[PDB]
């Protein structure tokens, strides 16, 4: 059908069709009289998978022969989403499979919808890992993603009576055609036990053993024949585990619970033992695998030359003391040499400055679970603090501040401090974030070792986030500038020369309209909700969090509603306000915010005076597959976190690439986005980081805003009195109380500027031509935010490896 989707040659189409029928028969054990759409999906998935394996085997053979430096990306989350279309895109099979299935009398897009998301992540951090894997493969790096194969990923969100309900994401029930179990490479992982000191050093003994079984998933590069591996560990009990008899077998679940479920927290630390076990489990199994591969090339001086370990947040921070443990206790290296190797091998990416998100493990947990690691952390700390003391003599406050061990009622290990000490590089994820790190929470460390601190602004893969989810836009762009931009997104700058091109303006606007119609149809079909596709699609999709300020969006929505109710017969630009995202199950305020959104919808969507001029939709079960649908459909991207709180954001970048304008604070990567596009082409509002600091200094008083803004008063009075909850007038008391008395994120302080800025948005939307021209200016300058750029920077500035667009033999 379209060019970017590749060739549909007669030879390939015929070959795909026969292998499809082969898999349906031999693999699925079905005939075409009993086969369901799901069977057809699996037959296609198996057919496409076959095309990966040849390239997968030869890529891994290529690495064995060339022995390049290997990159190990350690993450507790990989938010992969669906794999079928991505695989087709990267192998140039999309049109051929489209043709092959059509000739079999099947709609491929229908089959694509059957695939479950691999939802092994919470949001941005897990999705960043997924984009990174894609870019590393596309840039020909010898890279391995290492994580946990959760049996249950991020919960499926059901909305019931306006409330979030969670259900288990049983993503593996029908099987996962993409993974290959590798039980032959199963590794033991040790827990508990005790430390014994001998003549020949420390020994970790009397441990409980849990087996780590790897499952390998192929990660194809974009049309370069590179297929890298994501290896995910599954917890298995040893066969002599607890070996009355029946109970001992049933108690195997205790061990295997380690890989059972993803902790559903976004940007929030829950100090639970099971989570710590997960963190060590991935680290211990991964490091053995790394060392095994390294030895299969005794001399650990070359370890840092052949290995890079990237810590995605502090979650895999135990890699540092674990590497030390292995080098010192098992390989018998002296401390100093082991430490040198460790530091040069490890690098740490920080993703947050929110205090509640920072990992601080109680010493008593580490003492019981990982007694040798605690000893190593203590020794790391002492030697590190000796360096601090030597650099800043007499500065006893600094010593306390920089210690890996935090004092208090419960002693804790600050994992971020551990990571900085044991890494040669520490990076933030957007320029403003990296600067905040050096100025605030890691200031002491930056003063001690300024060379360690870097920025690596986040990115998104233009394969998934343009070509896959927005083929129409990919195509109209390719018509003008060719296909090279897909793996060289900076080429989108060439589109600046088309900003006054009447054909291009029409096409850009046509593609958006088509996307909106398709999404309006999706909503009716799958959720039975009526929306006006001519309205401005105003969308905020991301995890529900106070810092992300879905509440500020809510206030604006109510403002628009109240203004309509006051002047019913005045013209307002029609809007469909879509808000979606999951709340962590234990996050009460976030669950209340979801209820508020639906409560507002229940009032607004049924007011006859409003008509179709304002609709409020809560998008249920927001996830990667839903993002791929709603983002291409968006006109306005809400990126309205309090300045200084959203480390980068990546949703922002997705919207920019897909032809939405951005309303946002100068937070995270929004700053760089506005810088790239030009501030004129962004809807920037609200406090900057410095304004937030000034407000904190004099004290934030929400009442002041309430007293001085009548429109804001009205909303709060509406919330308090039960306007949006008549049967439970006090339902939103917690929300109002928080807003009025303990709002850490200063919702009210940005309200006026936000509403005003939103008026500027509506004004521009009234002029379709100028809206689209600004859209073109955004798409055209979104090149910097390709994860190919990000990964190339990691490669050159941290990992010490050169990216390559050179193709491997097919
Ligand atoms: O554990 C802290 C954390 C941070 N994050 C998110 O990481 C993303 C990827 O770097 C960022 O874009 C986002 O700003 C951050 O909140 N998720 N969890």
mmCIF file of C-alpha atoms in Angstrom, residues 174-535:
data_model
loop_
_atom_site.group_PDB
_atom_site.id
_atom_site.type_symbol
_atom_site.label_atom_id
_atom_site.label_comp_id
_atom_site.label_asym_id
_atom_site.label_seq_id
_atom_site.Cartn_x
_atom_site.Cartn_y
_atom_site.Cartn_z
ATOM 1 C CA UNK A 174 -1.683 -17.855 25.395
ATOM 2 C CA UNK A 175 2.109 -18.108 25.251
ATOM 3 C CA UNK A 176 4.790 -15.731 24.036
ATOM 4 C CA UNK A 177 6.030 -16.660 20.547
ATOM 5 C CA UNK A 178 8.845 -14.114 20.755
ATOM 6 C CA UNK A 179 10.799 -15.579 23.670
ATOM 7 C CA UNK A 180 13.056 -18.618 23.706
ATOM 8 C CA UNK A 181 13.501 -20.371 27.050
ATOM 9 C CA UNK A 182 17.126 -21.204 27.707
ATOM 10 C CA UNK A 183 16.917 -23.619 30.697
ATOM 11 C CA UNK A 184 20.419 -24.851 29.788
ATOM 12 C CA UNK A 185 21.868 -21.497 30.905
ATOM 13 C CA UNK A 186 20.153 -21.550 34.311
ATOM 14 C CA UNK A 187 22.256 -19.955 37.057
ATOM 15 C CA UNK A 188 22.040 -20.154 40.859
ATOM 16 C CA UNK A 189 21.296 -17.039 42.928
ATOM 17 C CA UNK A 190 21.987 -16.954 46.679
ATOM 18 C CA UNK A 191 19.980 -15.371 49.486
ATOM 19 C CA UNK A 192 20.260 -15.082 53.284
ATOM 20 C CA UNK A 193 23.002 -17.229 54.827
ATOM 21 C CA UNK A 194 25.910 -15.774 56.795
ATOM 22 C CA UNK A 195 29.473 -14.551 56.337
ATOM 23 C CA UNK A 196 32.337 -16.796 57.424
ATOM 24 C CA UNK A 197 35.882 -15.447 57.629
ATOM 25 C CA UNK A 198 38.746 -17.786 56.764
ATOM 26 C CA UNK A 199 42.512 -17.604 56.202
ATOM 27 C CA UNK A 200 41.703 -17.162 52.495
ATOM 28 C CA UNK A 201 39.056 -14.440 52.979
ATOM 29 C CA UNK A 202 35.288 -14.141 53.419
ATOM 30 C CA UNK A 203 32.869 -16.930 52.498
ATOM 31 C CA UNK A 204 29.119 -16.551 52.047
ATOM 32 C CA UNK A 205 27.628 -19.771 53.426
ATOM 33 C CA UNK A 206 24.354 -21.481 54.428
ATOM 34 C CA UNK A 207 22.542 -19.631 51.659
ATOM 35 C CA UNK A 208 19.140 -20.345 50.196
ATOM 36 C CA UNK A 209 19.469 -21.021 46.476
ATOM 37 C CA UNK A 210 17.037 -19.761 43.852
ATOM 38 C CA UNK A 211 17.610 -20.680 40.204
ATOM 39 C CA UNK A 212 17.583 -18.022 37.514
ATOM 40 C CA UNK A 213 16.338 -19.350 34.188
ATOM 41 C CA UNK A 214 16.898 -17.074 31.188
ATOM 42 C CA UNK A 215 14.400 -16.343 28.434
ATOM 43 C CA UNK A 216 15.821 -14.663 25.346
ATOM 44 C CA UNK A 217 13.859 -12.264 23.177
ATOM 45 C CA UNK A 218 15.260 -10.977 19.878
ATOM 46 C CA UNK A 219 15.706 -7.232 19.447
ATOM 47 C CA UNK A 220 15.967 -6.460 15.708
ATOM 48 C CA UNK A 221 17.764 -3.344 14.468
ATOM 49 C CA UNK A 222 16.139 -1.216 11.777
ATOM 50 C CA UNK A 223 16.916 -2.934 8.448
ATOM 51 C CA UNK A 224 20.537 -3.646 9.359
ATOM 52 C CA UNK A 225 20.189 -7.416 9.969
ATOM 53 C CA UNK A 226 21.353 -6.956 13.554
ATOM 54 C CA UNK A 227 19.336 -8.878 16.136
ATOM 55 C CA UNK A 228 20.371 -8.315 19.728
ATOM 56 C CA UNK A 229 19.125 -10.141 22.798
ATOM 57 C CA UNK A 230 16.990 -9.128 25.709
ATOM 58 C CA UNK A 231 17.594 -11.770 28.377
ATOM 59 C CA UNK A 232 14.997 -11.943 31.127
ATOM 60 C CA UNK A 233 15.417 -14.123 34.208
ATOM 61 C CA UNK A 234 12.688 -16.333 35.674
ATOM 62 C CA UNK A 235 12.893 -17.642 39.243
ATOM 63 C CA UNK A 236 12.877 -21.417 39.720
ATOM 64 C CA UNK A 237 13.215 -23.515 42.874
ATOM 65 C CA UNK A 238 15.982 -26.141 43.009
ATOM 66 C CA UNK A 239 14.649 -29.720 42.755
ATOM 67 C CA UNK A 240 15.755 -30.596 46.295
ATOM 68 C CA UNK A 241 14.004 -27.403 47.507
ATOM 69 C CA UNK A 242 12.732 -27.979 51.059
ATOM 70 C CA UNK A 243 13.500 -31.656 50.323
ATOM 71 C CA UNK A 244 5.782 -33.222 54.563
ATOM 72 C CA UNK A 245 6.455 -34.128 50.924
ATOM 73 C CA UNK A 246 3.389 -32.437 49.370
ATOM 74 C CA UNK A 247 3.901 -29.177 51.285
ATOM 75 C CA UNK A 248 7.608 -29.092 50.347
ATOM 76 C CA UNK A 249 6.663 -29.210 46.658
ATOM 77 C CA UNK A 250 3.936 -26.584 47.136
ATOM 78 C CA UNK A 251 6.405 -24.332 48.963
ATOM 79 C CA UNK A 252 8.485 -24.048 45.775
ATOM 80 C CA UNK A 253 6.216 -21.083 44.998
ATOM 81 C CA UNK A 254 8.022 -19.164 47.749
ATOM 82 C CA UNK A 255 11.221 -19.148 45.664
ATOM 83 C CA UNK A 256 9.441 -18.630 42.351
ATOM 84 C CA UNK A 257 7.480 -15.615 43.628
ATOM 85 C CA UNK A 258 10.598 -13.520 42.927
ATOM 86 C CA UNK A 259 9.729 -13.218 39.230
ATOM 87 C CA UNK A 260 5.968 -13.343 39.742
ATOM 88 C CA UNK A 261 4.896 -9.707 39.621
ATOM 89 C CA UNK A 262 6.114 -6.266 38.608
ATOM 90 C CA UNK A 263 5.869 -3.730 41.392
ATOM 91 C CA UNK A 264 3.330 -1.284 39.926
ATOM 92 C CA UNK A 265 4.940 1.900 41.291
ATOM 93 C CA UNK A 266 5.945 4.775 39.067
ATOM 94 C CA UNK A 267 8.462 7.180 40.594
ATOM 95 C CA UNK A 268 7.857 5.846 44.116
ATOM 96 C CA UNK A 269 9.984 3.655 46.368
ATOM 97 C CA UNK A 270 8.375 0.788 48.262
ATOM 98 C CA UNK A 271 10.923 -0.791 50.612
ATOM 99 C CA UNK A 272 9.618 -4.355 50.493
ATOM 100 C CA UNK A 273 11.758 -7.486 50.830
ATOM 101 C CA UNK A 274 10.320 -9.119 47.711
ATOM 102 C CA UNK A 275 11.391 -6.053 45.707
ATOM 103 C CA UNK A 276 14.914 -6.258 47.122
ATOM 104 C CA UNK A 277 15.016 -9.943 46.171
ATOM 105 C CA UNK A 278 13.988 -9.026 42.633
ATOM 106 C CA UNK A 279 16.740 -6.435 42.474
ATOM 107 C CA UNK A 280 19.425 -8.838 43.636
ATOM 108 C CA UNK A 281 18.062 -11.708 41.558
ATOM 109 C CA UNK A 282 18.445 -9.814 38.283
ATOM 110 C CA UNK A 283 21.882 -8.485 39.295
ATOM 111 C CA UNK A 284 23.347 -11.785 40.532
ATOM 112 C CA UNK A 285 22.173 -13.829 37.544
ATOM 113 C CA UNK A 286 23.211 -11.115 35.057
ATOM 114 C CA UNK A 287 26.715 -10.663 36.495
ATOM 115 C CA UNK A 288 27.456 -14.422 36.389
ATOM 116 C CA UNK A 289 26.301 -14.387 32.779
ATOM 117 C CA UNK A 290 28.502 -11.363 32.019
ATOM 118 C CA UNK A 291 31.562 -12.937 33.650
ATOM 119 C CA UNK A 292 30.916 -16.298 31.947
ATOM 120 C CA UNK A 293 30.734 -14.581 28.535
ATOM 121 C CA UNK A 294 33.852 -12.521 29.359
ATOM 122 C CA UNK A 295 35.909 -15.581 30.336
ATOM 123 C CA UNK A 296 34.746 -17.368 27.173
ATOM 124 C CA UNK A 297 36.609 -14.857 24.984
ATOM 125 C CA UNK A 298 41.499 -14.822 34.353
ATOM 126 C CA UNK A 299 42.841 -11.309 33.630
ATOM 127 C CA UNK A 300 40.273 -8.800 34.875
ATOM 128 C CA UNK A 301 42.353 -5.747 33.891
ATOM 129 C CA UNK A 302 40.667 -5.944 30.477
ATOM 130 C CA UNK A 303 37.178 -6.419 31.994
ATOM 131 C CA UNK A 304 36.238 -2.694 31.627
ATOM 132 C CA UNK A 305 37.528 -2.770 28.028
ATOM 133 C CA UNK A 306 35.201 -5.627 27.143
ATOM 134 C CA UNK A 307 32.242 -4.848 29.419
ATOM 135 C CA UNK A 308 30.005 -1.865 30.108
ATOM 136 C CA UNK A 309 27.235 -2.164 32.686
ATOM 137 C CA UNK A 310 24.572 0.516 32.566
ATOM 138 C CA UNK A 311 22.422 0.799 35.678
ATOM 139 C CA UNK A 312 18.933 1.972 34.772
ATOM 140 C CA UNK A 313 18.195 3.907 37.960
ATOM 141 C CA UNK A 314 19.366 2.505 41.302
ATOM 142 C CA UNK A 315 17.179 -0.581 40.946
ATOM 143 C CA UNK A 316 20.122 -2.739 39.854
ATOM 144 C CA UNK A 317 22.572 -0.859 42.143
ATOM 145 C CA UNK A 318 23.538 -4.139 43.846
ATOM 146 C CA UNK A 319 25.585 -4.801 40.697
ATOM 147 C CA UNK A 320 28.313 -2.690 42.315
ATOM 148 C CA UNK A 321 28.783 -4.679 45.553
ATOM 149 C CA UNK A 322 27.956 -7.916 43.699
ATOM 150 C CA UNK A 323 30.739 -7.286 41.168
ATOM 151 C CA UNK A 324 33.022 -6.501 44.125
ATOM 152 C CA UNK A 325 31.890 -9.687 45.878
ATOM 153 C CA UNK A 326 32.663 -11.835 42.847
ATOM 154 C CA UNK A 327 36.026 -10.182 42.119
ATOM 155 C CA UNK A 328 37.220 -10.160 45.745
ATOM 156 C CA UNK A 329 35.646 -13.296 47.263
ATOM 157 C CA UNK A 330 35.622 -15.609 44.244
ATOM 158 C CA UNK A 331 38.300 -14.389 41.827
ATOM 159 C CA UNK A 332 40.594 -13.368 44.718
ATOM 160 C CA UNK A 333 41.446 -9.902 43.397
ATOM 161 C CA UNK A 334 42.687 -7.354 45.903
ATOM 162 C CA UNK A 335 40.112 -4.737 46.913
ATOM 163 C CA UNK A 336 41.760 -1.791 45.145
ATOM 164 C CA UNK A 337 42.030 -3.599 41.799
ATOM 165 C CA UNK A 338 38.491 -4.991 42.019
ATOM 166 C CA UNK A 339 37.234 -1.480 42.793
ATOM 167 C CA UNK A 340 39.069 0.033 39.827
ATOM 168 C CA UNK A 341 37.495 -2.596 37.558
ATOM 169 C CA UNK A 342 34.051 -2.033 39.096
ATOM 170 C CA UNK A 343 34.150 1.761 38.733
ATOM 171 C CA UNK A 344 35.329 1.605 35.085
ATOM 172 C CA UNK A 345 32.680 -1.009 34.262
ATOM 173 C CA UNK A 346 29.625 0.597 35.860
ATOM 174 C CA UNK A 347 27.700 3.709 34.923
ATOM 175 C CA UNK A 348 24.556 5.016 36.562
ATOM 176 C CA UNK A 349 21.572 6.822 35.124
ATOM 177 C CA UNK A 350 19.434 8.850 37.509
ATOM 178 C CA UNK A 351 15.803 9.348 36.539
ATOM 179 C CA UNK A 352 14.345 11.372 39.413
ATOM 180 C CA UNK A 353 14.891 13.956 42.134
ATOM 181 C CA UNK A 354 11.660 13.145 43.986
ATOM 182 C CA UNK A 355 12.630 12.093 47.550
ATOM 183 C CA UNK A 356 9.859 9.466 47.802
ATOM 184 C CA UNK A 357 11.260 7.776 44.672
ATOM 185 C CA UNK A 358 14.855 7.433 45.879
ATOM 186 C CA UNK A 359 15.850 3.964 47.043
ATOM 187 C CA UNK A 360 16.941 3.844 50.651
ATOM 188 C CA UNK A 361 17.087 0.280 51.916
ATOM 189 C CA UNK A 362 16.878 -0.469 55.661
ATOM 190 C CA UNK A 363 20.178 -1.950 56.825
ATOM 191 C CA UNK A 364 18.286 -4.704 58.700
ATOM 192 C CA UNK A 365 16.858 -6.031 55.406
ATOM 193 C CA UNK A 366 20.279 -6.144 53.722
ATOM 194 C CA UNK A 367 21.786 -7.645 56.868
ATOM 195 C CA UNK A 368 19.402 -10.606 56.731
ATOM 196 C CA UNK A 369 19.069 -11.019 52.961
ATOM 197 C CA UNK A 370 22.542 -10.124 51.701
ATOM 198 C CA UNK A 371 24.965 -10.092 54.652
ATOM 199 C CA UNK A 372 28.120 -10.134 52.496
ATOM 200 C CA UNK A 373 26.856 -7.230 50.365
ATOM 201 C CA UNK A 374 26.196 -5.097 53.461
ATOM 202 C CA UNK A 375 29.784 -5.741 54.577
ATOM 203 C CA UNK A 376 31.013 -4.706 51.142
ATOM 204 C CA UNK A 377 28.821 -1.575 51.130
ATOM 205 C CA UNK A 378 30.219 -0.618 54.561
ATOM 206 C CA UNK A 379 33.767 -1.036 53.245
ATOM 207 C CA UNK A 380 32.945 0.954 50.096
ATOM 208 C CA UNK A 381 31.518 3.689 52.316
ATOM 209 C CA UNK A 382 34.545 3.897 54.638
ATOM 210 C CA UNK A 383 37.016 4.120 51.748
ATOM 211 C CA UNK A 384 34.803 6.631 49.940
ATOM 212 C CA UNK A 385 34.423 8.806 53.044
ATOM 213 C CA UNK A 386 38.207 8.659 53.557
ATOM 214 C CA UNK A 387 38.510 10.242 50.100
ATOM 215 C CA UNK A 388 35.903 12.878 51.010
ATOM 216 C CA UNK A 389 37.697 13.612 54.299
ATOM 217 C CA UNK A 390 41.013 14.016 52.455
ATOM 218 C CA UNK A 391 39.468 16.360 49.863
ATOM 219 C CA UNK A 392 37.439 18.454 52.312
ATOM 220 C CA UNK A 393 39.313 18.201 55.641
ATOM 221 C CA UNK A 394 37.248 19.035 58.714
ATOM 222 C CA UNK A 395 33.984 19.197 56.761
ATOM 223 C CA UNK A 396 32.075 16.813 59.039
ATOM 224 C CA UNK A 397 28.679 17.877 57.690
ATOM 225 C CA UNK A 398 29.794 16.802 54.195
ATOM 226 C CA UNK A 399 30.841 13.380 55.530
ATOM 227 C CA UNK A 400 27.363 12.817 56.977
ATOM 228 C CA UNK A 401 25.671 14.089 53.788
ATOM 229 C CA UNK A 402 27.751 11.946 51.418
ATOM 230 C CA UNK A 403 27.693 8.735 53.462
ATOM 231 C CA UNK A 404 26.119 5.712 51.747
ATOM 232 C CA UNK A 405 24.781 4.922 55.208
ATOM 233 C CA UNK A 406 22.006 7.210 56.416
ATOM 234 C CA UNK A 407 21.611 7.580 60.178
ATOM 235 C CA UNK A 408 18.348 7.738 62.137
ATOM 236 C CA UNK A 409 15.682 5.575 63.783
ATOM 237 C CA UNK A 410 16.300 2.990 61.065
ATOM 238 C CA UNK A 411 19.707 2.995 59.379
ATOM 239 C CA UNK A 412 19.368 2.992 55.582
ATOM 240 C CA UNK A 413 21.653 2.572 52.586
ATOM 241 C CA UNK A 414 21.272 5.359 50.056
ATOM 242 C CA UNK A 415 21.490 3.430 46.782
ATOM 243 C CA UNK A 416 22.013 6.589 44.708
ATOM 244 C CA UNK A 417 25.118 7.349 46.783
ATOM 245 C CA UNK A 418 26.311 3.773 46.299
ATOM 246 C CA UNK A 419 25.831 4.188 42.534
ATOM 247 C CA UNK A 420 27.734 7.473 42.271
ATOM 248 C CA UNK A 421 30.666 6.096 44.296
ATOM 249 C CA UNK A 422 30.892 2.896 42.233
ATOM 250 C CA UNK A 423 30.351 4.338 38.731
ATOM 251 C CA UNK A 424 32.686 6.240 36.400
ATOM 252 C CA UNK A 425 29.720 8.108 34.932
ATOM 253 C CA UNK A 426 26.495 9.476 36.364
ATOM 254 C CA UNK A 427 23.962 11.003 34.041
ATOM 255 C CA UNK A 428 20.622 12.729 34.229
ATOM 256 C CA UNK A 429 18.032 12.354 31.503
ATOM 257 C CA UNK A 430 17.487 15.950 30.352
ATOM 258 C CA UNK A 431 19.695 19.032 30.540
ATOM 259 C CA UNK A 432 17.671 20.757 33.284
ATOM 260 C CA UNK A 433 17.548 17.515 35.284
ATOM 261 C CA UNK A 434 21.303 16.919 35.006
ATOM 262 C CA UNK A 435 21.896 20.516 36.117
ATOM 263 C CA UNK A 436 19.504 20.082 39.064
ATOM 264 C CA UNK A 437 21.466 16.963 40.075
ATOM 265 C CA UNK A 438 24.730 18.930 40.156
ATOM 266 C CA UNK A 439 23.155 21.902 41.949
ATOM 267 C CA UNK A 440 21.007 20.077 44.506
ATOM 268 C CA UNK A 441 20.879 16.405 45.517
ATOM 269 C CA UNK A 442 24.299 15.333 44.178
ATOM 270 C CA UNK A 443 26.065 18.690 44.702
ATOM 271 C CA UNK A 444 28.570 17.237 47.188
ATOM 272 C CA UNK A 445 29.436 14.406 44.777
ATOM 273 C CA UNK A 446 29.744 16.770 41.839
ATOM 274 C CA UNK A 447 32.200 18.871 43.887
ATOM 275 C CA UNK A 448 34.237 15.757 44.705
ATOM 276 C CA UNK A 449 34.203 14.218 41.207
ATOM 277 C CA UNK A 450 32.923 16.717 38.610
ATOM 278 C CA UNK A 451 34.149 14.504 35.737
ATOM 279 C CA UNK A 452 31.607 11.775 36.572
ATOM 280 C CA UNK A 453 28.567 13.932 35.924
ATOM 281 C CA UNK A 454 27.006 14.002 32.474
ATOM 282 C CA UNK A 455 23.750 14.657 30.679
ATOM 283 C CA UNK A 456 22.105 12.256 28.260
ATOM 284 C CA UNK A 457 18.800 13.738 27.176
ATOM 285 C CA UNK A 458 16.218 10.995 26.688
ATOM 286 C CA UNK A 459 14.818 9.989 23.327
ATOM 287 C CA UNK A 460 12.198 7.769 21.738
ATOM 288 C CA UNK A 461 12.585 5.356 18.852
ATOM 289 C CA UNK A 462 11.196 6.810 15.627
ATOM 290 C CA UNK A 463 10.460 3.253 14.457
ATOM 291 C CA UNK A 464 7.748 2.502 17.012
ATOM 292 C CA UNK A 465 6.793 6.125 17.599
ATOM 293 C CA UNK A 466 6.427 7.295 14.032
ATOM 294 C CA UNK A 467 6.691 4.599 11.340
ATOM 295 C CA UNK A 468 4.734 1.971 13.270
ATOM 296 C CA UNK A 469 2.042 4.058 14.960
ATOM 297 C CA UNK A 470 1.727 6.799 12.327
ATOM 298 C CA UNK A 471 2.345 5.290 8.862
ATOM 299 C CA UNK A 472 0.368 8.109 7.190
ATOM 300 C CA UNK A 473 2.715 10.769 8.547
ATOM 301 C CA UNK A 474 5.796 8.641 7.909
ATOM 302 C CA UNK A 475 4.676 8.337 4.273
ATOM 303 C CA UNK A 476 3.894 12.009 3.511
ATOM 304 C CA UNK A 477 7.286 12.849 5.051
ATOM 305 C CA UNK A 478 9.059 10.146 3.011
ATOM 306 C CA UNK A 479 7.448 11.475 -0.181
ATOM 307 C CA UNK A 480 9.325 14.761 0.339
ATOM 308 C CA UNK A 481 12.646 13.786 1.926
ATOM 309 C CA UNK A 482 13.033 10.021 1.417
ATOM 310 C CA UNK A 483 13.275 7.229 3.997
ATOM 311 C CA UNK A 484 16.722 7.982 5.469
ATOM 312 C CA UNK A 485 15.232 9.996 8.359
ATOM 313 C CA UNK A 486 13.873 6.806 9.981
ATOM 314 C CA UNK A 487 17.399 5.981 11.212
ATOM 315 C CA UNK A 488 18.674 9.576 11.023
ATOM 316 C CA UNK A 489 15.870 11.643 12.526
ATOM 317 C CA UNK A 490 17.823 14.924 12.258
ATOM 318 C CA UNK A 491 16.878 14.862 8.557
ATOM 319 C CA UNK A 492 13.363 15.945 9.575
ATOM 320 C CA UNK A 493 14.887 19.471 9.594
ATOM 321 C CA UNK A 494 14.557 19.324 5.789
ATOM 322 C CA UNK A 495 10.803 19.700 6.395
ATOM 323 C CA UNK A 496 11.341 23.346 7.401
ATOM 324 C CA UNK A 497 11.579 24.116 3.665
ATOM 325 C CA UNK A 498 7.974 22.852 3.333
ATOM 326 C CA UNK A 499 6.399 25.037 6.036
ATOM 327 C CA UNK A 500 4.932 27.313 3.335
ATOM 328 C CA UNK A 501 4.168 24.418 0.979
ATOM 329 C CA UNK A 502 0.393 24.334 0.514
ATOM 330 C CA UNK A 503 0.363 20.663 -0.523
ATOM 331 C CA UNK A 504 2.359 19.626 2.559
ATOM 332 C CA UNK A 505 0.218 21.737 4.921
ATOM 333 C CA UNK A 506 -2.881 19.987 3.524
ATOM 334 C CA UNK A 507 -1.266 16.532 3.819
ATOM 335 C CA UNK A 508 -0.039 17.075 7.406
ATOM 336 C CA UNK A 509 -3.533 18.253 8.410
ATOM 337 C CA UNK A 510 -5.125 15.402 6.433
ATOM 338 C CA UNK A 511 -3.002 12.776 8.220
ATOM 339 C CA UNK A 512 -4.003 14.211 11.605
ATOM 340 C CA UNK A 513 -7.699 14.262 10.664
ATOM 341 C CA UNK A 514 -7.485 10.631 9.500
ATOM 342 C CA UNK A 515 -5.747 9.645 12.756
ATOM 343 C CA UNK A 516 -8.467 11.417 14.765
ATOM 344 C CA UNK A 517 -11.276 9.714 12.811
ATOM 345 C CA UNK A 518 -9.647 6.303 13.280
ATOM 346 C CA UNK A 519 -9.290 6.957 17.022
ATOM 347 C CA UNK A 520 -12.853 8.302 17.312
ATOM 348 C CA UNK A 521 -13.951 5.021 15.710
ATOM 349 C CA UNK A 522 -11.747 3.000 18.098
ATOM 350 C CA UNK A 523 -13.446 4.690 21.061
ATOM 351 C CA UNK A 524 -16.972 3.854 19.844
ATOM 352 C CA UNK A 525 -16.109 0.268 18.858
ATOM 353 C CA UNK A 526 -14.087 -0.768 21.925
ATOM 354 C CA UNK A 527 -15.518 1.508 24.652
ATOM 355 C CA UNK A 528 -18.905 2.791 23.332
ATOM 356 C CA UNK A 529 -18.143 6.523 23.689
ATOM 357 C CA UNK A 530 -19.193 9.303 21.286
ATOM 358 C CA UNK A 531 -16.663 12.052 20.481
ATOM 359 C CA UNK A 532 -16.571 14.901 17.943
ATOM 360 C CA UNK A 533 -13.555 14.355 15.612
ATOM 361 C CA UNK A 534 -13.668 18.044 14.645
ATOM 362 C CA UNK A 535 -12.855 19.093 18.205
#
